[PDB]
Symmetry: D3
Amino acid sequence: TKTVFHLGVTEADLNGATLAIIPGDPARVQKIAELMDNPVFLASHREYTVYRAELDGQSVVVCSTGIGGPSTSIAVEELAQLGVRTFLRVGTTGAIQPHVNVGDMIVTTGSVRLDGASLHFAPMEFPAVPDFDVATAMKAAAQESGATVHMGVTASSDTFYPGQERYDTFTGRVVRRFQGSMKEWQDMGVLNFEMESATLLTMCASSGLKAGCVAGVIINRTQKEIPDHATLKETEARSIKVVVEAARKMLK
Amino acid sequence: KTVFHLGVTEADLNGATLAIIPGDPARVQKIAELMDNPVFLASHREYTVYRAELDGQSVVVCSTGIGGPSTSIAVEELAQLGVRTFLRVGTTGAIQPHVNVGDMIVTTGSVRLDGASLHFAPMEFPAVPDFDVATAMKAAAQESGATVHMGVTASSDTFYPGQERYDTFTGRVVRRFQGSMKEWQDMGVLNFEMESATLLTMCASSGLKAGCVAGVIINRTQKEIPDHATLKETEARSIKVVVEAARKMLK
Amino acid sequence: KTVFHLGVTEADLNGATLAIIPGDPARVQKIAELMDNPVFLASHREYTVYRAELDGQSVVVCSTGIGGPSTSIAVEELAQLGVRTFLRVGTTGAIQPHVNVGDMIVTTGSVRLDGASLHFAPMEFPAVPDFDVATAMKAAAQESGATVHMGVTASSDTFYPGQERYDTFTGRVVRRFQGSMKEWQDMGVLNFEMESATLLTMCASSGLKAGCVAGVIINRTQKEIPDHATLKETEARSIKVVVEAARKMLK
Amino acid sequence: KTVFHLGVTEADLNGATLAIIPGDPARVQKIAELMDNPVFLASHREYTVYRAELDGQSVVVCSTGIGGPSTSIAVEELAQLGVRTFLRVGTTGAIQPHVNVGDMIVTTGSVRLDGASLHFAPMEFPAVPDFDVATAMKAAAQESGATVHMGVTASSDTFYPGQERYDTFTGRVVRRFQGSMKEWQDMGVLNFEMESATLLTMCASSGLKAGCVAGVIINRTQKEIPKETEARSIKVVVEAARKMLK
Amino acid sequence: TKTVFHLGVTEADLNGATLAIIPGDPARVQKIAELMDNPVFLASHREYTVYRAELDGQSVVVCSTGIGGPSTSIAVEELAQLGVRTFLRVGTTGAIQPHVNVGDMIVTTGSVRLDGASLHFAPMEFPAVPDFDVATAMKAAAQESGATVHMGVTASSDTFYPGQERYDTFTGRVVRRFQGSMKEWQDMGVLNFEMESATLLTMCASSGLKAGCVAGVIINRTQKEIPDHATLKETEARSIKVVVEAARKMLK
Amino acid sequence: KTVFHLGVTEADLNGATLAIIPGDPARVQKIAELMDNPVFLASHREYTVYRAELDGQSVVVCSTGIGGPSTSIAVEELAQLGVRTFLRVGTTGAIQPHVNVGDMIVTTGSVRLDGASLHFAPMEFPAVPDFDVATAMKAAAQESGATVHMGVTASSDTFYPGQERYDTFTGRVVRRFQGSMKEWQDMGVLNFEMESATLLTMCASSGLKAGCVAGVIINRTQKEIPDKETEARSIKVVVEAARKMLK
Ligand SMILES: [Mg+2]
Ligand SMILES: [Mg+2]
Ligand code: NA
Ligand code: NA
Ligand code: NA
Ligand code: NA
Ligand code: NA
Ligand code: NA
Ligand code: NA
Ligand code: NA
Ligand code: NA
Ligand code: NA
Ligand code: NA
């Protein structure tokens, strides 16, 4: 049986799946899988929890990535070794534009590469861009849920704190590179911050894999950092329903 | 109030908020004549400017010249005069064996092998089209009956060393570009051209909507040589497609 | 108080100012149980947190996940809760023929093949441990009877191309990393891992004390699949060593 | 063979080894008519090409368009056809208060604020003219009676943000270029234009002789947006060409 | 048999020395050598003055480097060609931290690479770090002298003026890269500026050579208290006493 | 007021506004003695300083040591004391087969393979000489009867790997510099040395006039390590170039 170093699954375990839904949080894996048919737990090791399920009769993998490009790059590579070719990222995000409201959804059309792992696949000049079919399916699924949907650029940072220009920290300092950066991205039309899309999109677009990202907005950095619990719960539930419908459209 | 290089005023554009931007000044009139009431506005340097009407709405056609620098001037000055949507059209060579002469490429992102893009956003920023423009271009290209490829384009400030051409005066390619064509091929890049990184980066970071569509007229991975009829048909299809994409963008 | 990700409060740490930070959440309980009164505090995402007591002093054990990004969150949030000293423990792959499986490595500096270190200091800044922590780790490792190497570690944001692995889906390694393992070997680099550049740069530029100790589980010049009993012995020794290094840091 | 963009053959050039390269295609005939027997060769895109004779020797005049990319095509294709010396003439905006409109500038080196230069040499390489060309341009400019400055030119891939112009659609300039005009002024840079970094780097790294001479049409300490001094500039470049051909 | 090109010495001249003490100033070479047994002048060319001496019966070289990484890189290379494997840098320095006092000693644990020559040996990602044994010996020797010792990061600049953010200069200008840089390094915990350690440490750590740096503090830019003649002469003398004792510990 | 490193005052320079700056302190007296009334001013570290008179005007001669860092100190401190024109003289290794031992090179621009230039101007800025100085150096070199080349010089922070030398302790050259000699040769670069990028960038961005002239002592197409007429000719040329710069 062909094995992988980290994910603890074999190709046979995936029952022919060529599409994976890849949340960051291992606890979200079962929640996504149960929206599909016959969900089965496969493995859990480190930040990687893996389930299989069936969508319109076709096998689909759900696999967490952990936070950050490095752990994401391992999961994507090992799933690709086992036959996966399409990767649908789902999560929640913090918007930086005043016109993007908490509870809206964002489909990334390109990422600002504020990461390191993307450079291990392509030099900085290469665009961190989704597959067009995936982005199209995500937009359609997000609109069909009734959400307000934004298509646009996402800033993808290797840190939660200084690289997103947060000052409420142990040192209260932000290195020169990132001082004033939130305003710069705002002025350039960037919609939101997250921590994995630059790696995911660059890796996949340079390796013959299809990828995209969809996210529900849980905070707006121009407003407040502490989300309201009921609003957050509704946004999380809608986001995973949307990504499953986007997967259905990709497997049509 | 006349913009410095293009030699037109806002009133000359008759309310147009969309421009079709070919590189070659001689193609401007040909595109304008696919629409209604084409009117010559100005010609200076590489910038020939026409207006026309598409479903009753004014549209500008303006050439850019070769390269990001001359393109950046045209986009800026058109934006000063109210243009918000920019549709690049042209023909191109492909670098993938599965892309055939006569197919169409709609760029989903560009490798920034240029300098002017950096005058608008740092290198980390993606040279990506507006999603509505890319969607309209894909639809128009597919409705034409052509085979359409969505993917990455390598956008070079040179025709020769930055496209790893060795049939040159020196035969030299600087270290940065040695082996680069195979690298881009292995990364799935569809084609080289010379303006999209500047155009897409400038527009995506400035509140403007842009995209690129091109007909494939040569493939340097293929031994077969296309004939004159196929090349003429491809050039003609490329501009018919961009006009239909403009139609889809009108509100 | 409250932190965004770790789900613990300052009160939960019972005055701890030192943390042992493995990568794998499953190792946290194993480390905590080498000390007195281990208490499970929280588990969320890749972050499992325990407290224990070492010579009567509270110590926190907190996993980081794989990579600089998740590590940077844990270190920041622990620092918000009063932690000032961070002891990284784990297993590693050596790249030097003279470093044997079962040896231990204490990092004296890291090659910054990551992105998160740049969010704390520009590339010119050295990814260097605190001298007291490195000294304590060397002493603990040597006192255990292990063969110990002090030297430079290459710290990569990827497991695959950034460590020049070719047995992959594409079999390709980007130009930057082609030939890189031989380059690091020739420069005397001991091993690869994926968190030290971020950890050491963040701490050395932020007034925090950090170091890294690791047991060698593979040698890249030999084989990729480790022998089970040898690996188990090395893992057990590594966490015993880091606990003794923590003992040496207590004041 | 006929080169891909310029539409001319080696035979069309009648043995010319020197080219004068203005940016604007409309200036090509104006330069050519200052010499003997000017003949139109071709026009395609931004490239208009004439041949003429100077002291009995064939000379090419070929426009480049705006920017390093289109310039790099013209220089390469002319070099394929035997041209070895390239004399750039154009206009420029001064950034030093003491340089006045109508003055002339001969570039001794360019700040590489372009992309195409990097397709010929890494950034460490100097964007420097051939010393004989720079010497001939200085002499020709002095002999015309103009006030001449030798010095460094900032060569930008954009007209707007890379020259720190703010009267624009966005009114914004990216971090790299904020405060850059003052920085170049403090470093003694004389002027801005858009082709010299590409031209000089490409030629100095490829065995070709190049230089640039320009007329000041605006002082950027005064404002952002701008016949004797266009006419004088092309008279000067033709005299510089005469000095280069023995 | 060969005579090295710049230093003008042969391997036989070194009488088997495998350790060198490398001050910057040629006039300090004899002062260091005379702290050991049987000091003998070997050669002087340009900024390179070379002596041999004996320490606990073992031959030791003392060789000046001149100011800056470039001239240092020549001396280290040519000594390595002649069998030298351990390099102990000694000098005096300013400090940029308020808690570092005149008369204290700094042992460098890593250097900020604000130089060019380090890049001729390893790319910027590589750490400018000392050999651990050398740093340990220098700490012990410095403590045994009675001085207060600081272990930490040093900023190593190719210039004395703009790269140390000095404005009292001919132009009064500091290029963008270095504006605000002193405060940045101070906030990052950097102890001091000097002009050779990044080159020395990077070259040696990437070439199989052991190196370290120790320096006595003779001025503090954050304090406007002028130390007197006595404390400065004492600090220079202590610095070289310390480096010789560190050499003794390396040869034990 | 005495500058920090050079050990001289403004009064010591007797109104000199031009300096000849060799690398080797032992060459300072030799250059000064080619002029009238040479006077030893100071020696400390790699900095030996003399004054002399050339056609009645005071000229300084000051060594720089090897490398951009020590050069940048000397140039700055001389500028603090009123010097505005800096004439670098020295030896060099040619990398073009048509340049012979004994020829002279006047640098028209330098490849910035150094670090100190970046402390004065970002990498995009050209390491170029003042045109008057380069013109005076070309004229002095040609009037001497020498074969003179104008062109680009590669200016390296190291003697060994940055000049792609392999007869070294490690026998290795870092990726950046592997194949670099051939690359510079193909790009028409004439020679290697170690100070011009710093000197020219510093001066061109600081309102100071600088240039470099050098005699060729080795051709790197022949061998790696060099093996007196040329040294003497080079300093005679730089003194005559100084004469041409005097106003
Ligand atoms: Mg406005
Ligand atoms: Mg050897
Ligand atoms: Na992780
Ligand atoms: Na709102
Ligand atoms: Na090569
Ligand atoms: Na947009
Ligand atoms: Na390769
Ligand atoms: Na153009
Ligand atoms: Na700013
Ligand atoms: Na020196
Ligand atoms: Na340059
Ligand atoms: Na190599
Ligand atoms: Na100047």
